[PDB]
């Protein structure tokens, strides 16, 4: 969260394992694994999304049988902002991988192109 020093708030980020409907609001999203992330004390969350899968290895294509899950972020509270402070705060987004990470079956990719 790259906002001001004075503005605070609480943001809830959740995970939903697949096989259900997509989560839309806070009432049906807090059931899964979630982190009540704060803004006052620290300014960086950490969400170790676990490895809950029926198969051992999932695929890397959009296939409906082996689906990852869902990720949703909700306002826990309204962003309390004192006066004489901008109203449009901003938030970035990162990704990583822990030490239990592995792939197999090397192949070639699709993002590059050559029309010649």
């Amino acid at each position: 969260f790259c906002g001001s020093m004075m503005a605070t708030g609480k943001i809830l980020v959740a995970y939903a394992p697949p096989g259900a409907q997509p989560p839309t609001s806070r009432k049906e999203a807090m059931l899964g694994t979630h982190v009540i992330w704060d803004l006052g004390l620290q300014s960086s969350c950490t969400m170790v999304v676990p490895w809950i899968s029926n198969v051992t290895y999932r695929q890397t294509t959009q296939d409906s049988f082996t689906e990852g899950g869902y990720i949703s972020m909700f306002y826990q509270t309204r962003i309390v902002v004192p006066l004489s402070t901008p109203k449009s705060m901003s938030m970035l987004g990162f990704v990583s991988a822990c030490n239990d990470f592995s792939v197999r079956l090397l192949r070639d990719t699709t993002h590059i192109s050559q029309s010649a």
Binding site: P17, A20, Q21, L31, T33, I52, N54, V55
Partner: protein, 260 residues
């Protein structure tokens, strides 16, 4: 001699005991891996969900030709085991199919209890593998068989349902070869009850249960019931299923599939 069969809280004893055939000779157990990376404990309702769930009663007649269920389809309507299946992502379970059918010393007729792992079924129309989800899962009332094959020709209103033939068993095999599955034959001459213990068999170690069905219980009348002189006669057949060593993992929001 009399079996005192108690799993969990309920109890089925008997006035006369016959047999107990374990499928493939391996009793159901938990996950026993000392070098497993998740050593934290999932939810194992091992003494709080083992009630003997009893399905609906079907009336077996003379010209009726068979019944078939799916597991774990036949528990989604009732029982707290149904609530521990919609909320969680995946699980594993071992079943105790206990089919009883009592009648007098003067009846006759032979039944057959089956347990087919990965029991597929055939369609009816010329559209291949084209079957909706509501007809794919009969739930607790179960489907039936048919004597001869009668496909669909209407191209405007799609039926999208199964139509298996009894001596083809739905899959496409002969009936006389079906005894290589784990089975038990209710011969009405001697005994009236039967039971089968099923372990968890799947390619994975653990799987979802909404989009998958492990076992399919097929009941086939090997010889039709004839009474002394009449031509219409109704005795019931009642099937009881209980989970054993069941466990789940991965909570999510509630998922309610439609059933038309």
């Amino acid at each position: 001699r009399v079996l005192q069969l108690t799993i969990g809280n309920s109890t089925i004893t008997t006035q006369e005991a016959a047999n107990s055939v374990v499928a493939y000779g391996r009793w159901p157990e938990f996950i026993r891996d000392d070098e497993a990376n998740p050593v934290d404990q999932p939810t194992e309702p091992d003494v709080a969900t083992c009630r003997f769930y009893t399905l609906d009663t079907v009336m077996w007649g003379k010209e009726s030709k068979g019944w078939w269920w799916k597991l774990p389809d036949a528990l989604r309507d009732m029982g707290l085991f149904g609530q521990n299946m919609y909320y969680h992502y995946l699980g594993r379970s071992g079943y105790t199919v206990h089919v009883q059918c009592n009648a007098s010393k003067f009846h006759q007729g032979a039944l057959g209890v089956f347990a087919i792992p990965e029991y597929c079924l055939a369609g009816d129309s010329d559209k291949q593998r084209y079957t909706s989800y509501a007809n794919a899962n009969p739930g607790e009332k179960g489907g039936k068989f048919y004597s001869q094959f009668n496909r669909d020709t209407a191209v405007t209103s799609p039926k999208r349902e199964f139509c298996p033939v009894d001596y083809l068993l739905g899959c496409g095999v002969l009936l006389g070869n079906a005894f290589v599955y784990p089975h038990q034959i209710i011969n009405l001459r001697t005994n009236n009850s039967a039971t089968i213990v099923l372990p968890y068999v799947n390619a994975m170690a653990i799987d979802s249960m909404v989009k998958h069905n492990n076992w399919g219980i097929a009941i086939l009348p090997l010889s039709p019931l004839d009474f002394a002189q009449e031509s219409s006669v109704e005795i019931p057949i009642t099937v009881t299923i209980a989970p054993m060593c069941s466990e789940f993992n991965g909570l999510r929001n509630v998922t309610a599939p439609k059933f038309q």
